[PDB]
Design a protein around this ligand. Sequence first.
Ligand SMILES: Oc1cccc(-c2nc(N3CCOCC3)nc3c2CCN3c2ccc3[nH]cnc3c2)c1
Length: 840
Amino acid sequence: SEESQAFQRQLTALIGYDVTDVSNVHDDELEFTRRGLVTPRMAEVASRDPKLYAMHPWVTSKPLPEYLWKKIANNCIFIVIHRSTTSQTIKVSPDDTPGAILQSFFTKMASEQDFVLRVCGRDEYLVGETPIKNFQWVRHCLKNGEEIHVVLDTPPDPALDEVRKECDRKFRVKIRGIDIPVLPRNTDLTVFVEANIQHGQQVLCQRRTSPKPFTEEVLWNVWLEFSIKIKDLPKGALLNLQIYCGVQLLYYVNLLLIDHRFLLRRGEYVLHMWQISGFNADKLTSATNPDKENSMSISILLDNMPNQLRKQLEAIIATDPLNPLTAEDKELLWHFRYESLKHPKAYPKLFSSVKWGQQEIVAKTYQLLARREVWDQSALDVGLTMQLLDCNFSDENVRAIAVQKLESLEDDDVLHYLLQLVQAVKFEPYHDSALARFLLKRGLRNKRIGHFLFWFLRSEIAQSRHYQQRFAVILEAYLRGCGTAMLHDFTQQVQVIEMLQKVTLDIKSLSADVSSQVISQLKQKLENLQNSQLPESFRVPYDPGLKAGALAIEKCKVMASKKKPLWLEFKCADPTALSNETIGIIFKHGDDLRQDMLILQILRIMESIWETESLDLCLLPYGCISTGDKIGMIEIVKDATTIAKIQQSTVGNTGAFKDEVLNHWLKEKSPTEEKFQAAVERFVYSCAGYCVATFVLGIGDRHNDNIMITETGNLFHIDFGHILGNNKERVPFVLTPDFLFVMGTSGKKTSPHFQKFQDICVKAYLALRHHTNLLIILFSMMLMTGMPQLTSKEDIEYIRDALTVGKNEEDAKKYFLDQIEVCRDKGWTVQFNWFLHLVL
Ligand SMILES: Oc1cccc(-c2nc(N3CCOCC3)nc3c2CCN3c2ccc3[nH]cnc3c2)c1
């Protein structure tokens, strides 16, 4: 039992936070939340079949795309089984279950026990009752023109990931005063306090204090009387106290007026507040600043139908999420709420039209909710679901119908949206929520989700004071059920990257290009690191199937980059592997990688969209995990080099590029013209996607040292640090002459390979528009929870313009096709400027 409090200190150092340390509380919610979560932990743990859990087959139920059938002939597929030296090679119909070849070997291909299949190099299996074309690896092996390879061998023990044993008065708030140990500001202003009663961003009522002289301490002793009545207070309503000084918002804090037990909140409070750098999901947190020594305090006290209408209505429900409802709109929605209830696409706007500070309306709402059979019968729409989980919605019951829909989703989709679901917790009123528990079950039900959940949650715990307590209670909850096997890996992973962050920082300090000492100085630390203290092997945090062991010391180097990042390379710890070729991770302090994760994941989202219309655009949305404060890792795509550096090779230090160089570099890397096609093939496709992807996301305009290509023609962008920073010469995105001559064209021409691009984009762009709503919610959500300095809605209204909302298919492609021209009619103009900016 003191061995039980030894392991709680394990739990702690994995999390990077102490979920017992009641330093920064003023109620029992976090604990109550620890307690509250034990049930769903134990439930899902129990429900889970430990065999399939231990092997976590990674499977989809989606159609095999119309782009990926055409890589098969005669509806059979090769699967090269291996053993100690031995190796056979079976034909297979793309429906053969893993079980449909337990007999095509131990019997047909030539008492006995049971042993099952595993991909070569990876902790990645082919088990359970799924077609063979429904395993994600196979589809990849196919997609990339690769060929399967697996190892017959013993299943992993289900005993390994064992889990350990176990009133009609108006509301009144007294403002006593505010206190700061030092008042940094030297111009003596005045300041007042603004008490806002709030619900999901709607202010319900607002009362200020009388301005006073600003001093290190200011007392008012005043009751502020609100017009709202207590009866009318809705669970989740937030008391938002804010310090203004004249005008400017310097400090905010929040207190859930109704506690996690539905109790009105009675008492004396001293609340430590957050300052305001220079909406945002941080403005919403029930967390108080844990830095009591520097933070400002406040001190408070609480004692206690026609045509045109149906038309009008439908024209409202047919707008985007970002379209702002007028009062007329709202009253119309509310009055016709029962008709509105028939269309699930109206749910967001409908519930946005509820007067939430009015007890009897909420009632009527809550009964309107009890008649959503139509909702309950609709096919899941992630966009819509998502949209009810955002900052605009703060009622449990509503928020719960959303989480209801997410329950349908198969694991392959949870993975797709996991990052943004995790961030969506930043908008939950309460630490315990349907969303948090839904993340939990799924976390525990499937090891893959489980892995990434850990890192997602841990990422935020490391660089958010506004949310580390809450995410920590959920992380702890996860770990208490993931099992000993994963506990193990997790602690292993944490060691490596801690071990390695150490190394990255020291190296920055030594530098402000490269030293002779610094390369061998690094070399010396990396030799010392391997010398004793590193794990025999660790799971690659962004590719969990893939264990890594020894450090190819000779190949690791400090990059000649802006900050000083470590190019590392690693030997694979898995003998059965298909190669000697290493695993390449970049480590980096200096940027916020949380922004890169977000954008990368959106990119994956954009792939899958295209999968629905059997498009494929060969993006490389590479691995990237934020792991701590301005510090995380990135996956190295092997064989790649940035455009900028393909410019130094032929042409050097500065200057406009030989529009041909790229293709020489290409033909230089194609061994056969019988491959080279595959290069400019890949390129024109890959070029297509990142152009669409970027303009849409508002990050197309980029220097070409931030744009890469593979020696097999695949092009991709990198480093998305604060590139969204808001009229000099501007280019919608990066389509430059070099990219063009590779197509085979000049400022007028039109190739058989260009028309293609000109065509294949427009296809890709309108494909995106079939999900206008989904992209808008994700992008909105991205700005509020990952890009600080994205204060304005003006920021958000980019995407709708970008996506040309409420417009005919055709006009759009004549919006888009022109965009490509601006880039044509610009060549290297803006690129040059970035050269004069990369030095200005
Ligand atoms: O998303 C991010 C965030 C921060 C840095 C990077 C980054 N990534 C990569 N990758 C990732 C995929 O494999 C190819 C190498 N290379 C990077 C960066 C930032 C700098 N950098 C870089 C810059 C110049 C180079 N010249 C030759 N290789 C280069 C790599 C990416």
